[PDB]
């Protein structure tokens, strides 16, 4: 009835739209975060990129809401005698939405309250324990509205490794499923909740990707997406 | 390796570039051209339609062109004591493409000459007969830098009548075929030449549509858009 | 709801529920009709291969009807100072079907009458000229339990040239549309008509071709298919 | 270049291969295991289902093998006074295959030692622990011909709920995928190794389901399959 899908192997800024520091390097990688000349992730660092068509999500004449399923392949790298920070995010937030505060908030949030009017639903792949909101281990999280997830999961991050997401939302159950595999290490990783995105996002949102990278020294990682996928579907009635 | 594809019952602005007359009515139709309050359509009017997100057609590198196939529905009516003008044309286009000369060039030209930078690919629904160019009876048309089509096609035009259109393209044997059907009709019509797309496109192209009115009084037609799909593939090897 | 499709470039036997004189070749092609050792046709050939798998085309306790679409190519040959005969059709049969009387009644028909019983639905590619119900021209034909085509189109056919063909069915509207085209010649053809499905076929049916040769010296062909594609949707309601 | 893709919301036998006590009821259930009059399960049962058409998993001559996925929605049920047994699993097996011993073998296994003749790739949902191989818990696990399964992950076996499961695997990095959600519950469970298909199936495979039922009084279950989607892709090299 209102079908979108979209799938690369290998990205151009001709089809997205680029905040901040987010960059295509000429391998046609995603890299969201700065990287400096000598292939060096630097600090204070965030980028945004999004597919530049908006995505319907919803309609409130008909009530209906979207099933939609993403798959992207992620590599986060940390340098030397370096920790890894701040992780990255897979994002459906308002048409035109513009970058918030960097390192921890993930250039999604300006604090860590809830905000019922973030209109935010994002799957978090955290590589830093911040003392006032997170799970002590490295996580994955489903966030709505808040940095402060509704729910994690345990992830054995791997500095170096390609990490292959699935994240699917079924509207009928409105369960949210996220997993990450390590083809490499063949480790494996889900979580899921159910989120009511017809009271937290608008009828229209963009879809992509968000990264930071930390403000203080010895915490810094590279955040480059390698491949995307992205399948939506929303019934009108024929 | 490269997909896209998106599939429209509906249509909102929100995922749109709209140029000149073109506008979604608040039944979520596209009206390329314009029409006043009583519903009738306007002398003189041009219209142009685009999906917000480019398209990448073919690959410098790795040499290859896309394969695409696009299905819409439209409606072309005419009202009473006048004929049909000028047509509507399925469009690809550089990114950024600007509407041309309006009339029988269909916002596509500035004249009927051939024009190696116009950059032009389009399948024409041509209702008036330009005596400079077009064969006499109404048409079907596959458009290569140039109004005058590199091969056309009877087409019995019905005014009011639902066409259901189907154009495709192989990459593989650059065959472009397109077809319209009315299904209350049961009429169906179909026309195919080779298309080098490599030599023509931009890698990177916008898709969708474009329409005018005849200029003269009593030539003047609505050109709506009902629904539309599109898919294209673009290989890149892995 | 219920969805199945397929596709194949090379075809095998594994998959095929073969009948009478059909065979895979070793290039994995699937032959019809009879070829002997010079790789000549022979006469009075029969053949028909189907998808091992039965398709639902309609339920009885919702009433929907599915919507199909089948895409393929043909090559049809004549060997030096012959005629062509008698062609190849894609059919929709009832699971089970067997092969019927051969020559102009293409494995489907005992007789050229109309029988109610026969349960076919069959899109013909005729290349000789039948006296008795069939038109003068070779044709494209819609059969619905008779050898006598609802509708027919002219067919320009050319021998040893490839055939891509296209076939769509909307349930919506009942409409069946059949297409020709020559990739190397950039020649096409089209054919259009209403079949209701629902009093014609059985719940569950077979699908894929049927072929045969002529049954007088003079009139032969090669009838084979190079590749395959079908996909058909049916409704439940979630 | 050879795609294979089928859904079924409900089920029916026309279009599938059934074994031993292997039922499809009247309300679309694909009930792989007997269940009485009273809808009580019953002991020592076991059964197999498979669709009809045969999928090829590779080639010998281009050496490509296939990439496929799954997903099912099951319900595993126990009568009160009983735990449950034995479980169910999806299977790939070679054309034709017969089932073999019951019990904890799932009908699969003669006996609990490796059988490289076996030609039995499969992922299984063990609800009964046995001494002689099994972890503890109650387990998903990837079986490759052998009942040992060579990576488990404990799975929270909650009787009468539906369970949704997913299994991919990416024939590039060998890598099999799977996860099971209870959408109602919010958990969700997964587990992935390497299988090397080329190796251990034929060219040729059937797909789809085996369960079985305790053979001691105190331990049975129902093994119920309510919706399926197969999808598998294999390039011959266009
Ligand atoms: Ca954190
Ligand atoms: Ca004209
Ligand atoms: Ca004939
Ligand atoms: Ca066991
Ligand atoms: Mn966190
Ligand atoms: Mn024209
Ligand atoms: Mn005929
Ligand atoms: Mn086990």
Do not use: C, M
Not at 18 to 26: F, M, N
Not at 170 to 180: E, G, N
Not at 192 to 215: H, N, R, Y
Not at 216 to 234: P, Q, R, Y
Request: proline content about 4%.
């Amino acid at each position: 009835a209102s079908q979108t899908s979209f799938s690369f192997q290998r990205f151009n800024e001709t089809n997205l739209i680029l905040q901040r520091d987010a960059t295509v390097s000429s391998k046609g990688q995603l890299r969201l975060t700065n990287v400096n000349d000598n292939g060096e992730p630097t600090l204070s660092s965030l980028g945004r990129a999004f597919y530049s068509a908006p995505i319907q999500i919803w309609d409130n004449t008909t009530g209906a809401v979207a099933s939609f399923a993403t798959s992207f392949t992620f590599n986060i790298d940390v340098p030397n005698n370096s920790g890894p920070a701040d992780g990255l995010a897979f994002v459906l937030l308002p048409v035109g939405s513009q970058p918030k505060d960097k390192g921890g908030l993930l250039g999604l949030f300006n604090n860590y309250k809830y905000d019922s009017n973030a209109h935010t639903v994002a799957v978090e792949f955290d590589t830093l324990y911040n003392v006032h909101w997170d799970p002590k281990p490295r996580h994955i999280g489903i966030d709505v509205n808040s940095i402060k997830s509704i729910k994690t999961t345990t992830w054995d991050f791997v500095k170096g490794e390609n990490a292959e997401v699935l994240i699917t939302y079924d509207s009928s159950t409105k369960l949210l499923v996220a997993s990450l595999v390590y083809p490499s290490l063949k480790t494996s990783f889900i979580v899921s909740d159910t989120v009511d995105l017809k009271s937290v996002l608008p009828e229209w949102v963009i879809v992509g990707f968000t990264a930071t990278t930390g403000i203080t020294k010895g915490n810094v990682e590279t955040n480059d997406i390698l491949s995307w996928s992205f399948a939506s579907k929303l019934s009108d009635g024929t």
